[model samples]
Target: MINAIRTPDQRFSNLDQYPFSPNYLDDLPGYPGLRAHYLDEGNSDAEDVFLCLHGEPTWSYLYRKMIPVFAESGARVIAPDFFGFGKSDKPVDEEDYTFEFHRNFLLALIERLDLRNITLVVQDWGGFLGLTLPMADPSRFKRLIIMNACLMTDPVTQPAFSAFVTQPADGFTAWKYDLVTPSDLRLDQFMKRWAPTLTEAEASAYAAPFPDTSYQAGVRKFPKMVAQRDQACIDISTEAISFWQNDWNGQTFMAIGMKDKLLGPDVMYPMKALINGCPEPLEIADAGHFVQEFGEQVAREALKHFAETE
Candidate 1:
């Protein structure tokens, strides 16, 4: 029995430029009594599915700029808030937010929805977990749209990359760890640093999930969950790499926020080498870590690329 808290609906009221209705599934096999919220927009019967997964500190709200583009292009877009972010139910205990916990929920959700012909769009923690999913059931996915993210394979070889991952906890992680209890955790500074173009309302939407620190177990644990030398992350990612390199028979698209310091070209270029046939990314010179902040343009470019390839 996992104890969790769901943010009141009123807390999410009047989000800037976010007008989609919330969809929920409260009865997923392992997650009883916790309602998971997602945006299931566009034609429900559409054959192609776009599964957009946001990283830490952001939710389905992150995809607002891109969802309509894909939906308008006739693909059903399913963007879910991870267990602790967005409108999803938040587990009170930080220990409850594990790699497996979040991963399992996603797998179950995909199964419950019977989603297929998927174009997986991922960034940050989204890429960390979402990149590993297709190997579990590759048939469900047909394309990949990756940005500012990488797979953590065993014996992580690159010296610089390894150093970056293993470096002592930075400001963000430090702040998260120092919190004795869940309070209204603020991230406006972090947002302004990375995505300077975000309006006040847009930044507030990103912070909406954690009405207080109690609702932040997922957020607080995500940075620590990064698998630098974790054998499990390495093992699953190893298999995922093999799948992408050899078994994946799907189109691949990549975009890079050149300004992103954490997972920029240096990180992504190596990743592109790992994915078989992944072409040169559509580079956005001004974008940062949250490449999706340039969502509308990215969505249009991705659709155009897909159409051209088809």
Candidate 2:
């Protein structure tokens, strides 16, 4: 049995601009006993499903700006906090959080919820993991809305995916350094440094799920996973590239955060070419790594693009 800690519901009280009701699943196939948290907003019966996947250290709270916009456009929104983040139960052992562990949870969640007509929204680790989902069940995913992120692939054979994996003397190297190096990582300050546009309360909300370092094993593992890029991650992503470049026939929209030092243009543009038929991206000039901070405009723009699709 896995030992896990659920953040007290009271810890999430009075969050900044977050007014959504809570939903949980305690009995997924592989994840037993650990209750996962997700925000199920908009029309429950709506055919258009926007699956907003959050990246490391942040939770469903990251999607506040875009969730309302997507829901307002008459699309259903399902945003889950990965088990280690947000209101979900946190595992005490970082070893429990593996590539397949997190990836499989998403697969189980999609099947459990019976989600279809998906417009996949992803960034950071969200993209690293979420981008691989459509290949698993292409029938469920119909469209894509990509942000600043890329696949984690074998460093030897894969050029673009390999290059971004700590190969950059640029921003990501420093980013991984900052994340993995620090033991007492302050989520609020870390969020502030990377996103830079957050209000004090907003930064605090990002820190809410993790009251102390014990609640942060999931936070600590993400950067290490990226840097290490174990054989499983590399092999899975290697196969995913071929699926994206060849088999994908869904509508796609990309938005890049120009100031995202880690997964900015350098990462996203190559990713765009990988996805079949992806058009030029809408560049958010002032936004950083957490492009979701400027998500309102991106959501509106993506809506307009999707409406214009043939």
Top candidate (TM-score):
2
How accurate locally is residue 35 in candidate 2, as Cα lDDT from 0 to 100? Answer: 95
Which parts of model 2 have CA positions greater than 4 angstroms off?
165-170
**What tens digits encode model 2's per-residue C-alpha lDDT throughout 78-133?**
99999999998999998999999999999999999999999999998998999889
Q: In candidate 1, which residue pairs clash?
A: 182-213, 182-214, 183-213
* Residue 70 of model 2, lDDT score: 97
Report, for every candidate in turn, its global Cα lDDT versus the true structure: 0.82, 0.89
| Strongest candidate by lDDT | 2
Tens digits of per-residue lDDT, candidate 1, 1-310, equal: 8898888888878789999998999999999888899899999999999999998788898899999999999999999988888888888998887777888999999999999999999998899899999989988999999988887555445443444454446533443344333354576555665689998888877777667677777877777766333567767767787887798778899999998756777778888888898988899999988999998999998888888977
Q: In angstroms, how far off is 277's CA in candidate 2?
A: 0.7
State the weakest 10-residue window (summed lDDT) of model 2.
Answer: 158-167
Q: Candidate 2, after superposition: displacement of residue 65 in Å?
A: 0.4
TM-score of 2: 0.97
What's the distance in Å from true for residue 55, model 1? 0.5
RMSD of each: 2.4, 1.3
